[PDB]
Each structure stands twice: as C-alpha cells, then as structure tokens.
C-alpha cells in the first residue's frame, strides 16, 4: 500500500482514537523502525481525539525507551492522550500544522459499593496528578500551571500550543 | 485498479463524507504525489457533503504545505468542508462541472456544566470565525461577507460559485 511506503520513510501514523489495538500497532512500528536503523529519527504523525490513557502510556513508554528520536507532528487535532503523545516528542522536534487544534483536560469517565467507588476515584486522581506532572515536564512549566489549565477542556491553536510549551515549531506554507 | 490508475496521473479523489480516514488517505496520497514529483500540479476531485472540520483541516494544511499546486475540481457537489477544500485549491486552478452544486454554511452540532458548555460554544464560534476568515481569503472577499452568507444553508450553482470566488472556471 501507500501507508507501507510511508513507513519505508520512517513515518508512523496515529489516526482516530487511541485504543489498545491502535496503540499496540504504533508500538510495533516503533520497535520495527528501530530494528531497521536505531540511529535515524522516526516521525510520529498524530491526528487523534484521545482515548485510553493506558494505551497511550504504552506508546509513551515506547517512545522514551527506543534509541531514535521520535519527532511528533499534529495534523487536524491532538486532544487528550493525543495531545499528551504530541507533547512527548523529542524536544525541538515537536511540530504542528498551522490550523491544527490542541486540547488538554483532566481525566473524565462516563460503579458499585462505596469502598469500590473510593478506590476508583482515588485511582482516577492519581492518573490526573501523573498526567499533569508529566505534561508540566513536557511544557517546561510549573505543575500548578497544568493543574489550573486542564481543570476543564482547554482548546489551543498551534501558536497558543507553541507558546505553552507543548510543541516547538509550526510548519508553514 | 482504476482509482490507482487515476493516481498515476496525479488525480486524488475525495468521495463522500470527510472523516479522519478519508482525510488521512487523501493526505497520504498528497504526500506520495509530492514525493513522486514535487514540481507537477496535483488534481483533487471532490464530490463530498462535508464532515469533520479537523479531518478537513489536515487535508487543507497538507494542500498548502506541499510544493505542488493542488488544483481542485467539484463534480456532483462540494458542500460544507467539501466546499471549504474546493475553495482551497490553487487560485486559477479551481474548477467545477456545469451541473455541480456548492453549499456553504456555518458549523452545526447534534453538554455538561454551564462552564463546560461555555468552553465548547466559544470553541465552536472560533471554528466558525476561522472557517469564514479562511474562506474569505480564498474568495478575495471579507470575513463579514462569509458570516452573512454562511448564516444559513447557501446553495450555489457552478456559475454562482465562480461569481462568489470559490472556483475559477467552469469546465464544459
């Protein structure tokens, strides 16, 4: 196919929601390209509304484990875990297209006994704090910045994202 | 098959709704065709009722980023984001067939706290303002013009789209 020809050039796509299946598909391509050449950069193109935090963490840990720099690029949108993975690119190599959209927010879901609800509520808050801390690192900001700015849905243009620290450059016409 | 045979002559199709995957197939072909020759025009044939704004923006930014001119042509219809992508072709190289139909309109939707509804309403108006402004540049008109003319569904004949500035030439 053509997508095979894009992988030939070290381009990996994440299009649509991040699920266990799509996440593991990205992981397989990352490991594969590093197998083919551990010394050339990889280009991770992201147009995603988000999805499973767990699946995204699987992509994240793979991006950081392999030797090659993983450049990230947003086309269309990078929202929630998609924005998370975008900000996780190699610093200096995180890009967005001019009319791309970035959105970040605290975790949201849509249980049983009071003990169980407390357990899952506490787990969700750990996820919230972990995601805020990692993204504070990505953006070179104070953790209080991300706590404040992800409280509700935070929509950003590419320039607002460049200024926030989530990407580095905006690709231009 | 035939669609790949059309791709050999640098013809790319968008048929039906604009979705993340129909969009990323188009983006992949655009990058491929530039890769095959960054110096020849590309011809983007559009018959679409519209779809995802973000999905369309990825095509739009790709059309403007690559070196080749992207000529656009409407057959059947180009509505909403389909009309957006049509108008986004290289100026001088945007075409429509004689009985093509163009339609433009403001964004529309099919939720939680008032604070949350405010954030999404404001974002919807920014998208509305961004689409009107970008389409105003495509037509060499003003944002205020596009706000007036997208307020409700605006159907245009091929001949009306050329007068409006969304296409350059009707093929006959």
């Amino acid at each position: 196919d053509i997508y095979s020809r894009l992988l030939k050039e070290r381009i990996v796509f994440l299009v649509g929601p991040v699920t266990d299946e799509s996440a593991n598909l990205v992981v397989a391509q990352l490991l594969f390209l590093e197998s083919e050449n551990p010394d050339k950069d990889i280009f991770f193109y992201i147009n995603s509304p988000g999805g499973s935090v767990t699946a995204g963490m699987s992509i994240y840990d793979t991006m950081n484990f392999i030797k090659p720099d993983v450049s990230t690029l947003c086309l269309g949108q990078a929202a929630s875990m998609g924005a998370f993975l975008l900000s996780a690119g190699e610093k200096g190599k995180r890009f967005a297209l001019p009319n791309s959209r970035i959105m970040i927010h605290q975790p949201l879901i849509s249980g049983g006994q009071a003990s169980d609800i407390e357990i899952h509520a506490r787990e969700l808050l750990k996820i919230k704090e972990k995601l805020n801390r990692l993204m504070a690192k990505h953006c070179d900001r104070d953790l209080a910045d991300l706590e404040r700015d992800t409280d509700r849905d935070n929509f950003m243009s590419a320039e607002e994202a460049k200024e926030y620290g989530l990407i580095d450059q905006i690709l231009e016409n | 098959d035939i669609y790949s045979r059309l791709l050999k002559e640098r013809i790319v199709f968008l048929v039906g709704p604009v979705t993340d995957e129909s969009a990323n197939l188009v983006v992949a072909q655009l990058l491929f065709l530039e890769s095959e020759n960054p110096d020849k025009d590309i011809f983007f044939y559009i018959n679409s009722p519209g779809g995802s704004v973000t999905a369309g923006m990825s095509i739009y930014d790709t059309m403007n980023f690559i070196k080749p001119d992207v000529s656009t042509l409407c057959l059947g219809q180009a509505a909403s984001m389909g009309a957006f992508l049509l108008s986004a072709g290289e100026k001088g190289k945007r075409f429509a067939l004689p009985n093509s139909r163009i339609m433009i309109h403001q964004p529309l939707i099919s939720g939680g706290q008032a604070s949350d509804i405010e954030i999404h309403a404001r974002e919807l108006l920014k998208i509305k303002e961004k689409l009107n402004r970008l389409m105003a540049k495509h037509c060499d008109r003003d944002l205020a013009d596009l706000e007036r003319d997208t307020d409700r569904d605006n159907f245009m004949s091929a001949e009306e789209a050329k007068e409006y500035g969304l296409i350059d030439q009707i093929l006959e």
Binding site: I11, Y45, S71, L73, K93, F95, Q169 | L31, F65
Partner: peptide, 6 residues
Amino acid sequence: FTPXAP
C-alpha cells in the same frame, strides 16, 4: 512534511 519532518 519536509523540511524538517522528514
């Protein structure tokens, strides 16, 4: 998307 990615 080159230059620069790739």
